[PDB]
Amino acid sequence: SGFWEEFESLQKQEVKNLHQRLEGQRPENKGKNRYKNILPFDHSRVILQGRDSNIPGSDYINANYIKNQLLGPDENAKTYIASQGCLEATVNDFWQMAWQENSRVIVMTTREVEKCVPYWPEVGMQRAYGPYSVTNCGEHDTTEYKLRTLQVSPLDNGDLIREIWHYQYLSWPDHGVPSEPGGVLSFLDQINQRQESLPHAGPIIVHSSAGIGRTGTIIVIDMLMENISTKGLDCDIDIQKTIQMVRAQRSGMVQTEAQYKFIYVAIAQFIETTKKKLEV
């Protein structure tokens, strides 16, 4: 009865039975997914532009638009893409997405591993990725994270130059979360300020290996921070509802027990810090 109540609640939250993931399941796209069971919902997937529909799977990337649906359209919420990240086979696809979406801020929640391969050149260097040139115009590190200032242009028009700020979290442990949330809160603060300075900017791209665990954690924390900042400390904070709201847009967002608890820890610290600054 307790069990059956809880089971009923879980059944009502089930979305993988409601929304198809045809595109990610295509055999033509097998090499474009890290995991065959971590796929974008068709309804919210990012569709790559300029692709030939006669080439099976050509428009596919393992990424979804994520909207903060707890803020109204009048409340100036930031928008996100939750993406699989740093997969060597899809690096050109990633930059196509970044360009077409007009994204000016990219958030990477992993260090390199060797599989997570860099998709930027070294400082002062320039590299081609499909139709695009990327130049690394500087790297600015803290203890916990790194800002790389990128400039991107089409190969066919070098006058068009676009600044992209690449934020890479360096301190996130393998198979766990940061011991304290201050680093992530600081990181998100910088990210938010950057995005706010660019009113024309497209969505913030957030990625991790699978694009659901760390990615979902970062996005949910950011959304809750935005909700508190926008609506105030008197506002109702419902983390479970927020997670369910993002999971309807990409399955499995916030994957682990440690991530789930971390969201509470981070938001508790954010509230307390805020109150200390308000002298409240």
PDB file of C-alpha atoms in Angstrom:
ATOM      1  CA  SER A   1       0.000   0.000   0.000  1.00  0.00           C
ATOM      2  CA  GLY A   2       2.947   2.208   0.882  1.00  0.00           C
ATOM      3  CA  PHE A   3       4.792   0.203  -1.778  1.00  0.00           C
ATOM      4  CA  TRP A   4       1.867   0.352  -4.208  1.00  0.00           C
ATOM      5  CA  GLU A   5       1.413   4.105  -3.618  1.00  0.00           C
ATOM      6  CA  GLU A   6       5.114   4.649  -4.363  1.00  0.00           C
ATOM      7  CA  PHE A   7       4.987   2.334  -7.399  1.00  0.00           C
ATOM      8  CA  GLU A   8       1.945   4.216  -8.747  1.00  0.00           C
ATOM      9  CA  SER A   9       3.830   7.510  -8.399  1.00  0.00           C
ATOM     10  CA  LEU A  10       6.848   6.101 -10.262  1.00  0.00           C
ATOM     11  CA  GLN A  11       4.607   4.720 -13.026  1.00  0.00           C
ATOM     12  CA  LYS A  12       3.074   8.175 -13.562  1.00  0.00           C
ATOM     13  CA  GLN A  13       6.577   9.699 -13.868  1.00  0.00           C
ATOM     14  CA  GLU A  14       7.603   7.192 -16.568  1.00  0.00           C
ATOM     15  CA  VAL A  15       8.333   9.068 -19.820  1.00  0.00           C
ATOM     16  CA  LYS A  16      10.461   6.625 -21.881  1.00  0.00           C
ATOM     17  CA  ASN A  17       7.183   4.801 -22.647  1.00  0.00           C
ATOM     18  CA  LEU A  18       5.553   8.066 -23.809  1.00  0.00           C
ATOM     19  CA  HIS A  19       8.245   9.670 -25.998  1.00  0.00           C
ATOM     20  CA  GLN A  20      10.175   7.865 -28.732  1.00  0.00           C
ATOM     21  CA  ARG A  21      13.940   7.799 -29.247  1.00  0.00           C
ATOM     22  CA  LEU A  22      13.880   6.508 -32.842  1.00  0.00           C
ATOM     23  CA  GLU A  23      16.714   8.693 -34.108  1.00  0.00           C
ATOM     24  CA  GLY A  24      19.313   7.602 -31.550  1.00  0.00           C
ATOM     25  CA  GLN A  25      18.369   3.928 -31.995  1.00  0.00           C
ATOM     26  CA  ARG A  26      19.104   3.999 -35.757  1.00  0.00           C
ATOM     27  CA  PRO A  27      22.017   1.633 -36.679  1.00  0.00           C
ATOM     28  CA  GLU A  28      23.421   4.435 -38.856  1.00  0.00           C
ATOM     29  CA  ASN A  29      23.904   6.427 -35.606  1.00  0.00           C
ATOM     30  CA  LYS A  30      25.451   3.629 -33.506  1.00  0.00           C
ATOM     31  CA  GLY A  31      28.937   5.197 -33.633  1.00  0.00           C
ATOM     32  CA  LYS A  32      27.526   8.573 -32.524  1.00  0.00           C
ATOM     33  CA  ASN A  33      26.418   7.314 -29.084  1.00  0.00           C
ATOM     34  CA  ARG A  34      28.717   6.421 -26.190  1.00  0.00           C
ATOM     35  CA  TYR A  35      26.014   4.141 -24.769  1.00  0.00           C
ATOM     36  CA  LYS A  36      23.222   2.478 -26.745  1.00  0.00           C
ATOM     37  CA  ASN A  37      20.763   2.992 -23.872  1.00  0.00           C
ATOM     38  CA  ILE A  38      21.531   6.695 -23.334  1.00  0.00           C
ATOM     39  CA  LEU A  39      19.684   8.440 -26.158  1.00  0.00           C
ATOM     40  CA  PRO A  40      17.918  11.771 -26.847  1.00  0.00           C
ATOM     41  CA  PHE A  41      14.143  11.988 -26.983  1.00  0.00           C
ATOM     42  CA  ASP A  42      13.112  12.730 -30.550  1.00  0.00           C
ATOM     43  CA  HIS A  43      10.805  15.562 -29.435  1.00  0.00           C
ATOM     44  CA  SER A  44      13.590  17.701 -27.930  1.00  0.00           C
ATOM     45  CA  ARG A  45      16.638  16.519 -29.880  1.00  0.00           C
ATOM     46  CA  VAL A  46      19.025  18.964 -31.504  1.00  0.00           C
ATOM     47  CA  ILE A  47      18.714  18.584 -35.288  1.00  0.00           C
ATOM     48  CA  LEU A  48      21.952  19.341 -37.137  1.00  0.00           C
ATOM     49  CA  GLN A  49      21.487  21.821 -39.998  1.00  0.00           C
ATOM     50  CA  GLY A  50      22.898  21.651 -43.522  1.00  0.00           C
ATOM     51  CA  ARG A  51      22.734  17.847 -43.577  1.00  0.00           C
ATOM     52  CA  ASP A  52      21.617  15.712 -46.516  1.00  0.00           C
ATOM     53  CA  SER A  53      18.417  13.858 -45.645  1.00  0.00           C
ATOM     54  CA  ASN A  54      19.491  11.143 -48.127  1.00  0.00           C
ATOM     55  CA  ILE A  55      22.426  10.236 -45.867  1.00  0.00           C
ATOM     56  CA  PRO A  56      20.910   8.049 -43.085  1.00  0.00           C
ATOM     57  CA  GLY A  57      21.307   9.685 -39.678  1.00  0.00           C
ATOM     58  CA  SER A  58      23.136  12.762 -41.038  1.00  0.00           C
ATOM     59  CA  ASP A  59      21.213  15.243 -38.831  1.00  0.00           C
ATOM     60  CA  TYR A  60      21.821  13.346 -35.575  1.00  0.00           C
ATOM     61  CA  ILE A  61      23.575  14.439 -32.422  1.00  0.00           C
ATOM     62  CA  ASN A  62      23.088  12.925 -28.963  1.00  0.00           C
ATOM     63  CA  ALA A  63      21.826  16.163 -27.384  1.00  0.00           C
ATOM     64  CA  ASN A  64      18.531  17.715 -26.249  1.00  0.00           C
ATOM     65  CA  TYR A  65      17.209  21.215 -25.653  1.00  0.00           C
ATOM     66  CA  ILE A  66      16.428  21.730 -21.955  1.00  0.00           C
ATOM     67  CA  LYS A  67      14.134  24.549 -20.816  1.00  0.00           C
ATOM     68  CA  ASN A  68      13.475  25.751 -17.270  1.00  0.00           C
ATOM     69  CA  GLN A  69       9.732  25.134 -17.344  1.00  0.00           C
ATOM     70  CA  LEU A  70       9.299  26.292 -13.728  1.00  0.00           C
ATOM     71  CA  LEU A  71       9.904  29.871 -14.884  1.00  0.00           C
ATOM     72  CA  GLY A  72       7.402  31.478 -17.272  1.00  0.00           C
ATOM     73  CA  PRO A  73       8.306  32.898 -20.736  1.00  0.00           C
ATOM     74  CA  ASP A  74       8.266  36.388 -19.169  1.00  0.00           C
ATOM     75  CA  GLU A  75      10.865  35.560 -16.475  1.00  0.00           C
ATOM     76  CA  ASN A  76      14.015  35.617 -18.641  1.00  0.00           C
ATOM     77  CA  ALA A  77      15.146  32.066 -17.870  1.00  0.00           C
ATOM     78  CA  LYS A  78      18.342  30.846 -19.517  1.00  0.00           C
ATOM     79  CA  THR A  79      18.023  27.890 -21.913  1.00  0.00           C
ATOM     80  CA  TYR A  80      20.341  24.885 -22.180  1.00  0.00           C
ATOM     81  CA  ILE A  81      21.450  22.031 -24.360  1.00  0.00           C
ATOM     82  CA  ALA A  82      22.306  18.810 -22.535  1.00  0.00           C
ATOM     83  CA  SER A  83      24.786  16.961 -24.735  1.00  0.00           C
ATOM     84  CA  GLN A  84      27.031  13.965 -24.859  1.00  0.00           C
ATOM     85  CA  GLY A  85      30.547  15.393 -24.980  1.00  0.00           C
ATOM     86  CA  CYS A  86      34.144  14.987 -26.188  1.00  0.00           C
ATOM     87  CA  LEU A  87      33.478  11.953 -28.408  1.00  0.00           C
ATOM     88  CA  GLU A  88      36.147  11.908 -31.138  1.00  0.00           C
ATOM     89  CA  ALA A  89      33.816  10.615 -33.877  1.00  0.00           C
ATOM     90  CA  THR A  90      31.285  13.432 -33.337  1.00  0.00           C
ATOM     91  CA  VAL A  91      33.600  16.426 -32.769  1.00  0.00           C
ATOM     92  CA  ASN A  92      32.552  18.043 -36.070  1.00  0.00           C
ATOM     93  CA  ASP A  93      28.888  17.447 -35.194  1.00  0.00           C
ATOM     94  CA  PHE A  94      29.430  19.156 -31.835  1.00  0.00           C
ATOM     95  CA  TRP A  95      30.838  22.308 -33.436  1.00  0.00           C
ATOM     96  CA  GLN A  96      28.020  22.310 -36.011  1.00  0.00           C
ATOM     97  CA  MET A  97      25.581  22.301 -33.086  1.00  0.00           C
ATOM     98  CA  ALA A  98      27.475  25.056 -31.254  1.00  0.00           C
ATOM     99  CA  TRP A  99      27.547  27.286 -34.352  1.00  0.00           C
ATOM    100  CA  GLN A 100      23.955  26.831 -35.527  1.00  0.00           C
ATOM    101  CA  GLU A 101      22.482  27.313 -32.044  1.00  0.00           C
ATOM    102  CA  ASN A 102      24.463  30.556 -31.543  1.00  0.00           C
ATOM    103  CA  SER A 103      25.772  29.154 -28.252  1.00  0.00           C
ATOM    104  CA  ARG A 104      28.322  31.502 -26.669  1.00  0.00           C
ATOM    105  CA  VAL A 105      28.946  29.527 -23.466  1.00  0.00           C
ATOM    106  CA  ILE A 106      29.986  25.863 -23.301  1.00  0.00           C
ATOM    107  CA  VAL A 107      30.165  24.031 -19.970  1.00  0.00           C
ATOM    108  CA  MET A 108      32.255  20.864 -19.741  1.00  0.00           C
ATOM    109  CA  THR A 109      32.066  18.855 -16.512  1.00  0.00           C
ATOM    110  CA  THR A 110      34.938  16.430 -17.147  1.00  0.00           C
ATOM    111  CA  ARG A 111      38.700  16.400 -17.561  1.00  0.00           C
ATOM    112  CA  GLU A 112      40.343  14.608 -20.488  1.00  0.00           C
ATOM    113  CA  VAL A 113      40.515  10.805 -20.254  1.00  0.00           C
ATOM    114  CA  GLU A 114      42.224   8.229 -22.480  1.00  0.00           C
ATOM    115  CA  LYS A 115      37.278   8.404 -23.706  1.00  0.00           C
ATOM    116  CA  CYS A 116      37.150  12.208 -23.632  1.00  0.00           C
ATOM    117  CA  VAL A 117      39.213  13.909 -26.346  1.00  0.00           C
ATOM    118  CA  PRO A 118      39.735  17.722 -26.573  1.00  0.00           C
ATOM    119  CA  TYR A 119      37.764  19.518 -29.303  1.00  0.00           C
ATOM    120  CA  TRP A 120      39.728  22.757 -29.004  1.00  0.00           C
ATOM    121  CA  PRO A 121      43.268  23.682 -30.129  1.00  0.00           C
ATOM    122  CA  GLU A 122      46.079  24.576 -27.719  1.00  0.00           C
ATOM    123  CA  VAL A 123      46.544  28.178 -26.565  1.00  0.00           C
ATOM    124  CA  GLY A 124      47.231  30.487 -29.503  1.00  0.00           C
ATOM    125  CA  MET A 125      46.534  27.717 -32.040  1.00  0.00           C
ATOM    126  CA  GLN A 126      43.797  27.292 -34.660  1.00  0.00           C
ATOM    127  CA  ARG A 127      42.142  24.101 -35.946  1.00  0.00           C
ATOM    128  CA  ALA A 128      39.469  23.180 -38.503  1.00  0.00           C
ATOM    129  CA  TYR A 129      36.400  21.148 -37.524  1.00  0.00           C
ATOM    130  CA  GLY A 130      34.184  20.528 -40.541  1.00  0.00           C
ATOM    131  CA  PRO A 131      33.039  23.925 -41.951  1.00  0.00           C
ATOM    132  CA  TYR A 132      34.469  25.819 -38.946  1.00  0.00           C
ATOM    133  CA  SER A 133      37.753  27.241 -37.682  1.00  0.00           C
ATOM    134  CA  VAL A 134      38.362  27.338 -33.912  1.00  0.00           C
ATOM    135  CA  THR A 135      41.127  29.458 -32.350  1.00  0.00           C
ATOM    136  CA  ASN A 136      42.133  29.183 -28.683  1.00  0.00           C
ATOM    137  CA  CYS A 137      42.760  32.796 -27.629  1.00  0.00           C
ATOM    138  CA  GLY A 138      43.689  32.038 -24.005  1.00  0.00           C
ATOM    139  CA  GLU A 139      43.241  29.763 -20.988  1.00  0.00           C
ATOM    140  CA  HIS A 140      42.505  31.128 -17.514  1.00  0.00           C
ATOM    141  CA  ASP A 141      42.600  28.567 -14.698  1.00  0.00           C
ATOM    142  CA  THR A 142      41.438  28.457 -11.090  1.00  0.00           C
ATOM    143  CA  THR A 143      41.921  25.587  -8.618  1.00  0.00           C
ATOM    144  CA  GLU A 144      38.608  24.000  -9.601  1.00  0.00           C
ATOM    145  CA  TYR A 145      37.975  25.059 -13.213  1.00  0.00           C
ATOM    146  CA  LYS A 146      39.329  26.586 -16.410  1.00  0.00           C
ATOM    147  CA  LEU A 147      38.077  29.268 -18.802  1.00  0.00           C
ATOM    148  CA  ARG A 148      39.181  28.956 -22.430  1.00  0.00           C
ATOM    149  CA  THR A 149      38.368  31.946 -24.648  1.00  0.00           C
ATOM    150  CA  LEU A 150      37.613  30.557 -28.105  1.00  0.00           C
ATOM    151  CA  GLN A 151      37.010  32.338 -31.399  1.00  0.00           C
ATOM    152  CA  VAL A 152      35.053  30.462 -34.066  1.00  0.00           C
ATOM    153  CA  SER A 153      34.463  31.344 -37.712  1.00  0.00           C
ATOM    154  CA  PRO A 154      33.221  29.548 -40.865  1.00  0.00           C
ATOM    155  CA  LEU A 155      36.105  28.556 -43.137  1.00  0.00           C
ATOM    156  CA  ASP A 156      34.256  30.287 -46.002  1.00  0.00           C
ATOM    157  CA  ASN A 157      34.018  33.667 -44.216  1.00  0.00           C
ATOM    158  CA  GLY A 158      36.898  34.619 -41.910  1.00  0.00           C
ATOM    159  CA  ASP A 159      35.398  38.052 -41.152  1.00  0.00           C
ATOM    160  CA  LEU A 160      32.571  36.416 -39.184  1.00  0.00           C
ATOM    161  CA  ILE A 161      34.263  35.813 -35.826  1.00  0.00           C
ATOM    162  CA  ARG A 162      32.338  34.666 -32.767  1.00  0.00           C
ATOM    163  CA  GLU A 163      33.624  34.577 -29.186  1.00  0.00           C
ATOM    164  CA  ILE A 164      32.768  31.400 -27.282  1.00  0.00           C
ATOM    165  CA  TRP A 165      33.600  30.997 -23.590  1.00  0.00           C
ATOM    166  CA  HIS A 166      34.481  27.415 -22.701  1.00  0.00           C
ATOM    167  CA  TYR A 167      34.231  26.554 -19.007  1.00  0.00           C
ATOM    168  CA  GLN A 168      35.813  23.251 -17.969  1.00  0.00           C
ATOM    169  CA  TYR A 169      35.397  21.863 -14.461  1.00  0.00           C
ATOM    170  CA  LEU A 170      38.660  20.178 -13.446  1.00  0.00           C
ATOM    171  CA  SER A 171      37.966  18.886  -9.928  1.00  0.00           C
ATOM    172  CA  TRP A 172      34.962  16.594 -10.426  1.00  0.00           C
ATOM    173  CA  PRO A 173      36.022  13.103  -9.194  1.00  0.00           C
ATOM    174  CA  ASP A 174      35.521   9.884 -11.165  1.00  0.00           C
ATOM    175  CA  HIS A 175      32.417   8.021  -9.915  1.00  0.00           C
ATOM    176  CA  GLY A 176      31.441  10.673  -7.345  1.00  0.00           C
ATOM    177  CA  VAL A 177      30.860  14.390  -6.700  1.00  0.00           C
ATOM    178  CA  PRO A 178      32.951  17.295  -5.270  1.00  0.00           C
ATOM    179  CA  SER A 179      33.415  17.091  -1.490  1.00  0.00           C
ATOM    180  CA  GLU A 180      32.194  20.694  -1.176  1.00  0.00           C
ATOM    181  CA  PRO A 181      29.839  22.624  -3.546  1.00  0.00           C
ATOM    182  CA  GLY A 182      31.625  25.999  -3.441  1.00  0.00           C
ATOM    183  CA  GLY A 183      33.575  25.300  -6.653  1.00  0.00           C
ATOM    184  CA  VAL A 184      30.457  24.465  -8.680  1.00  0.00           C
ATOM    185  CA  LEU A 185      28.586  27.457  -7.232  1.00  0.00           C
ATOM    186  CA  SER A 186      31.506  29.729  -8.193  1.00  0.00           C
ATOM    187  CA  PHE A 187      31.661  28.110 -11.652  1.00  0.00           C
ATOM    188  CA  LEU A 188      27.936  28.595 -12.273  1.00  0.00           C
ATOM    189  CA  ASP A 189      28.193  32.213 -11.080  1.00  0.00           C
ATOM    190  CA  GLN A 190      30.802  32.953 -13.786  1.00  0.00           C
ATOM    191  CA  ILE A 191      28.781  31.083 -16.428  1.00  0.00           C
ATOM    192  CA  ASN A 192      25.589  32.971 -15.538  1.00  0.00           C
ATOM    193  CA  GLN A 193      27.277  36.390 -15.664  1.00  0.00           C
ATOM    194  CA  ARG A 194      28.788  35.569 -19.069  1.00  0.00           C
ATOM    195  CA  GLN A 195      25.466  34.444 -20.558  1.00  0.00           C
ATOM    196  CA  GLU A 196      23.640  37.470 -19.114  1.00  0.00           C
ATOM    197  CA  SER A 197      26.133  39.809 -20.851  1.00  0.00           C
ATOM    198  CA  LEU A 198      25.114  38.306 -24.234  1.00  0.00           C
ATOM    199  CA  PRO A 199      21.312  38.778 -24.633  1.00  0.00           C
ATOM    200  CA  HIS A 200      21.471  37.461 -28.216  1.00  0.00           C
ATOM    201  CA  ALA A 201      23.234  34.248 -27.123  1.00  0.00           C
ATOM    202  CA  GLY A 202      21.659  30.889 -27.874  1.00  0.00           C
ATOM    203  CA  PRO A 203      21.453  28.113 -25.232  1.00  0.00           C
ATOM    204  CA  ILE A 204      24.299  27.226 -22.894  1.00  0.00           C
ATOM    205  CA  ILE A 205      25.721  23.871 -23.990  1.00  0.00           C
ATOM    206  CA  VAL A 206      26.419  21.576 -21.035  1.00  0.00           C
ATOM    207  CA  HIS A 207      28.126  18.243 -21.574  1.00  0.00           C
ATOM    208  CA  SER A 208      29.600  15.272 -19.759  1.00  0.00           C
ATOM    209  CA  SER A 209      30.621  11.807 -20.979  1.00  0.00           C
ATOM    210  CA  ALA A 210      27.016  10.550 -21.277  1.00  0.00           C
ATOM    211  CA  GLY A 211      25.363  13.994 -21.087  1.00  0.00           C
ATOM    212  CA  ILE A 212      22.922  13.061 -18.285  1.00  0.00           C
ATOM    213  CA  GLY A 213      24.611  12.611 -14.891  1.00  0.00           C
ATOM    214  CA  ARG A 214      26.971  15.494 -14.235  1.00  0.00           C
ATOM    215  CA  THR A 215      25.173  17.411 -17.013  1.00  0.00           C
ATOM    216  CA  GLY A 216      21.775  17.017 -15.337  1.00  0.00           C
ATOM    217  CA  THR A 217      23.276  17.894 -11.942  1.00  0.00           C
ATOM    218  CA  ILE A 218      24.807  21.153 -13.241  1.00  0.00           C
ATOM    219  CA  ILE A 219      21.644  22.164 -15.099  1.00  0.00           C
ATOM    220  CA  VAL A 220      19.288  21.455 -12.188  1.00  0.00           C
ATOM    221  CA  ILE A 221      21.511  23.382  -9.752  1.00  0.00           C
ATOM    222  CA  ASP A 222      21.662  26.266 -12.238  1.00  0.00           C
ATOM    223  CA  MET A 223      17.875  26.250 -12.732  1.00  0.00           C
ATOM    224  CA  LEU A 224      17.221  26.253  -8.987  1.00  0.00           C
ATOM    225  CA  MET A 225      19.744  29.084  -8.498  1.00  0.00           C
ATOM    226  CA  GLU A 226      17.963  31.025 -11.246  1.00  0.00           C
ATOM    227  CA  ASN A 227      14.569  30.280  -9.651  1.00  0.00           C
ATOM    228  CA  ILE A 228      15.773  31.558  -6.261  1.00  0.00           C
ATOM    229  CA  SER A 229      17.484  34.586  -7.804  1.00  0.00           C
ATOM    230  CA  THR A 230      14.468  35.474  -9.962  1.00  0.00           C
ATOM    231  CA  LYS A 231      11.549  34.673  -7.637  1.00  0.00           C
ATOM    232  CA  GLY A 232      13.306  35.106  -4.261  1.00  0.00           C
ATOM    233  CA  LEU A 233      14.138  33.107  -1.112  1.00  0.00           C
ATOM    234  CA  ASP A 234      10.426  32.932  -0.205  1.00  0.00           C
ATOM    235  CA  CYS A 235       9.831  30.798  -3.323  1.00  0.00           C
ATOM    236  CA  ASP A 236       9.007  27.093  -3.080  1.00  0.00           C
ATOM    237  CA  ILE A 237      12.018  24.933  -3.976  1.00  0.00           C
ATOM    238  CA  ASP A 238      10.985  21.469  -5.191  1.00  0.00           C
ATOM    239  CA  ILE A 239      14.062  19.563  -6.341  1.00  0.00           C
ATOM    240  CA  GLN A 240      12.249  16.306  -7.141  1.00  0.00           C
ATOM    241  CA  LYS A 241       9.759  18.142  -9.370  1.00  0.00           C
ATOM    242  CA  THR A 242      12.602  20.052 -11.056  1.00  0.00           C
ATOM    243  CA  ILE A 243      14.435  16.793 -11.794  1.00  0.00           C
ATOM    244  CA  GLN A 244      11.254  15.219 -13.199  1.00  0.00           C
ATOM    245  CA  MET A 245      10.729  18.332 -15.337  1.00  0.00           C
ATOM    246  CA  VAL A 246      14.208  18.000 -16.916  1.00  0.00           C
ATOM    247  CA  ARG A 247      13.932  14.192 -17.265  1.00  0.00           C
ATOM    248  CA  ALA A 248      10.882  14.744 -19.498  1.00  0.00           C
ATOM    249  CA  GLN A 249      13.254  16.565 -21.884  1.00  0.00           C
ATOM    250  CA  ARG A 250      16.193  14.138 -21.669  1.00  0.00           C
ATOM    251  CA  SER A 251      15.910  10.728 -20.002  1.00  0.00           C
ATOM    252  CA  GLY A 252      18.095  10.005 -16.965  1.00  0.00           C
ATOM    253  CA  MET A 253      19.103  13.579 -16.080  1.00  0.00           C
ATOM    254  CA  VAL A 254      20.681  13.371 -12.602  1.00  0.00           C
ATOM    255  CA  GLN A 255      21.689   9.726 -12.671  1.00  0.00           C
ATOM    256  CA  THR A 256      23.375   8.929  -9.312  1.00  0.00           C
ATOM    257  CA  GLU A 257      22.653   9.004  -5.587  1.00  0.00           C
ATOM    258  CA  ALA A 258      25.729  11.194  -5.056  1.00  0.00           C
ATOM    259  CA  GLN A 259      24.579  13.674  -7.723  1.00  0.00           C
ATOM    260  CA  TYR A 260      21.088  13.844  -6.190  1.00  0.00           C
ATOM    261  CA  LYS A 261      22.417  14.581  -2.692  1.00  0.00           C
ATOM    262  CA  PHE A 262      24.937  17.047  -4.148  1.00  0.00           C
ATOM    263  CA  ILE A 263      22.069  19.152  -5.558  1.00  0.00           C
ATOM    264  CA  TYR A 264      20.632  19.517  -2.042  1.00  0.00           C
ATOM    265  CA  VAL A 265      24.070  20.325  -0.582  1.00  0.00           C
ATOM    266  CA  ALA A 266      24.778  22.904  -3.309  1.00  0.00           C
ATOM    267  CA  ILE A 267      21.425  24.683  -3.009  1.00  0.00           C
ATOM    268  CA  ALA A 268      21.566  24.653   0.806  1.00  0.00           C
ATOM    269  CA  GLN A 269      24.983  26.333   0.624  1.00  0.00           C
ATOM    270  CA  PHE A 270      23.701  28.801  -2.001  1.00  0.00           C
ATOM    271  CA  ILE A 271      20.748  29.779   0.211  1.00  0.00           C
ATOM    272  CA  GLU A 272      22.922  30.141   3.329  1.00  0.00           C
ATOM    273  CA  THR A 273      25.596  32.192   1.524  1.00  0.00           C
ATOM    274  CA  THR A 274      22.881  34.421   0.045  1.00  0.00           C
ATOM    275  CA  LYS A 275      21.363  35.001   3.493  1.00  0.00           C
ATOM    276  CA  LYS A 276      24.792  35.868   4.937  1.00  0.00           C
ATOM    277  CA  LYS A 277      25.292  38.484   2.191  1.00  0.00           C
ATOM    278  CA  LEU A 278      21.767  39.846   2.762  1.00  0.00           C
ATOM    279  CA  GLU A 279      22.577  39.892   6.502  1.00  0.00           C
ATOM    280  CA  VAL A 280      19.378  37.859   6.873  1.00  0.00           C
TER     281      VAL A 280
END
